[PDB]
Design a protein around this ligand. Structure first.
Ligand code: 54K
Length: 231
DNA sequence: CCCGAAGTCCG
DNA sequence: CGGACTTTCGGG
């Protein structure tokens, strides 16, 4: 079965504009886990738009197929484009897509893909269907996969007043002893972000519960100005 | 335009 | 460990 024509067209058009000189530092930035074509976001967005203009966005029946096929291509720009495409199908994504999103998280995994899946796509799903959180979060925390653990921490990133504080702090407590940078830093980020909404709760939490030094320092980067640094 | 959100280098 | 500094991206 041939590659979906939309994917083939995107592959041809991106490849015709590759920049091997830029690809080298771009690949190093992601610690050489991926090949890059060397196309930065502004041009990558225009090249995708070119293909949508010519071919039209595929029928929704092929949404998951297109994303998978792009996920399977070697160069990282194809996963970035896949996430751009998934946003275009946003109004068609719902709770039945959680496993599909899980599988994207755990394949071709790094912060650049995971952080564009979790707080937006999964965040929106669990905001509408909070009763489904306990069908996934416990498994994610218990798994060997650091990106699922990071997903458990960051899905509520943007919740603001809708943050489930007890849940957030329970998740952090489960993962606070992790030596993994991407876990320590995710804890730092979610606390720093939630502190923009409820600084007193975050301050009390970090002063009275164990965290990796990195996590605590990142959490209070801004709010330490409000409370002061005791001698 | 601005600001706030991985990476290297150094003590 | 953590400060100083870097580019790229998204949002205001
Ligand atoms: C995630 C992140 C944080 N801070 C910066 N100064 C960055 N520059 C590029 N990504 C960044």
């Amino acid at each position: 079965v041939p590659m979906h024509p939309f994917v083939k067209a995107l592959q041809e058009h991106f490849t015709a504009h590759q920049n091997p000189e830029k690809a080298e530092p771009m690949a190093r930035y992601m610690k050489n886990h991926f090949l890059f074509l060397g196309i930065q976001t502004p041009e990558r967005r225009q090249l995708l738009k070119d293909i949508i203009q010519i071919h039209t966005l595929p029928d929704q029946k092929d949404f998951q197929i297109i994303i998978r096929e792009l996920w399977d291509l070697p160069e990282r720009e194809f996963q970035a484009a896949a996430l751009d495409i998934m946003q275009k199908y946003k109004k068609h994504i719902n709770e039945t897509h959680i496993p599909f999103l899980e599988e994207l998280i755990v394949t071709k995994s790094w912060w650049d893909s995971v952080d564009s899946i979790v707080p937006t796509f999964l965040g929106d799903i669990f905001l509408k269907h909070p009763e489904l959180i306990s069908a996934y979060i416990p498994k994610w925390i218990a798994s060997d996969n650091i990106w699922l653990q990071r997903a458990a921490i960051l899905f509520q990133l943007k919740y603001k007043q809708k943050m489930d504080e007890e849940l957030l702090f329970w998740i952090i407590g489960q993962l606070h002893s992790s030596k993994e940078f991407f876990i320590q830093k995710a804890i730092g980020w979610v606390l720093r972000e939630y502190a923009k909404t409820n600084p007193d709760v975050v301050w009390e939490y970090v002063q009275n519960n164990e965290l990796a030094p990195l996590s605590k320092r990142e959490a209070i980067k801004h709010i330490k100005q409000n409370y002061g640094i005791n001698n």
